């Protein structure tokens, strides 16, 4: 299980309903815990366990940091407008950065920009050089790889500050983050004139990793199974379906198998 602290910034030239000019969102182990936007201009708590474990100075510094970032991405959009010949269009600038704590203790860091839904510039694994996707992004790269102290600063944040605040957050939220919630599973089916398609739905499981597969006489039918993507419910739990088409007379041979941390053994379910 790869633990993660990640921030996602989104800066647009043309806000619209649901899309403020700037949004910054923080995640621990895949789950929201803080949010900032240019609507409020406030780092706000998005999970009880982070609120319960910080003082108002925390929210005040975090708000200060993101107000600065908001101003800087306003400048970055103008900067990128002077780097391409597109006129008055919708511009989207995105940032993702953070750190992974892997199983063995080793660590990785990330700092990647996207412009107009494509890669723009990304910090490499050594964390001292960048990959530019195009000539516009190469102007940023030469500019940045010239500044020894800025390079060190970022490497240190991702290697040291990010990782240790991730550990603090993991402490703060252990009882939420490492809880288990059982999937409530239902197999449905509709026989048509010649083909019965079975549908296995798993409702409300936590944590997010799950394996759902279809079995004929206990033997997996991987090529015949069709999986939706894992998608969230409102209360931080998750949902997945898996279907398989079967011959009606062979109905009785088919069971849906769910592998999940909340289940003592892999669970089997039937129509």
């Amino acid at each position: 299980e790869p633990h993660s602290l990640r921030y996602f910034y989104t800066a647009v030239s043309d806000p619209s309903p649901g899309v403020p000019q700037f949004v910054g969102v923080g995640y621990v182990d895949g789950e929201v815990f803080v949010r900032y936007d240019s609507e409020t201009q406030r780092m706000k708590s998005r999970a009880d366990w982070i609120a319960a474990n910080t003082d108002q100075q925390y929210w005040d510094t975090e708000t200060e940091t993101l107000q600065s970032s908001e101003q800087i991405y306003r400048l970055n959009l103008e900067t990128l407008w002077g780097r391409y010949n597109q006129s008055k269009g919708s511009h989207t600038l995105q940032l993702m950065y953070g750190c992974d704590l892997l199983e063995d203790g080793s660590t990785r860091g990330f700092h990647q920009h996207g412009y107009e839904g494509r890669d723009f510039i990304a910090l490499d694994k050594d964390m001292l050089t960048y990959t530019a996707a195009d000539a516009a992004a190469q102007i940023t790269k030469r500019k940045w790889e010239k500044d020894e102290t800025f390079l060190e600063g970022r490497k240190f944040y991702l290697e040291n500050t990010c990782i240790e605040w991730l550990r603090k957050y993991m402490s703060y939220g252990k009882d939420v983050l490492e809880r288990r919630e059982r999937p409530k599973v239902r197999v449905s089916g509709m026989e048509a004139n010649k083909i019965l398609t079975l549908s296995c739905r798993a409702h409300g499981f936590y944590p997010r990793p799950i394996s759902i597969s279809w079995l004929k006489d206990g033997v997996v039918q991987e090529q015949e199974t069709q999986r939706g993507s894992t998608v969230p419910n409102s209360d931080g739990t998750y949902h997945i379906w898996a279907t398989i088409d079967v011959l009606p007379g062979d109905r009785d041979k088919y069971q849906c198998r769910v592998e999940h941390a909340s289940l003592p053994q892999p669970g089997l379910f039937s129509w």
Binding site: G24, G26, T61, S69, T79, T140, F150
Partner: peptide, 9 residues
Amino acid sequence: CAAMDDFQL
């Protein structure tokens, strides 16, 4: 803790 943005693009 969010990082302080010591450089623009």
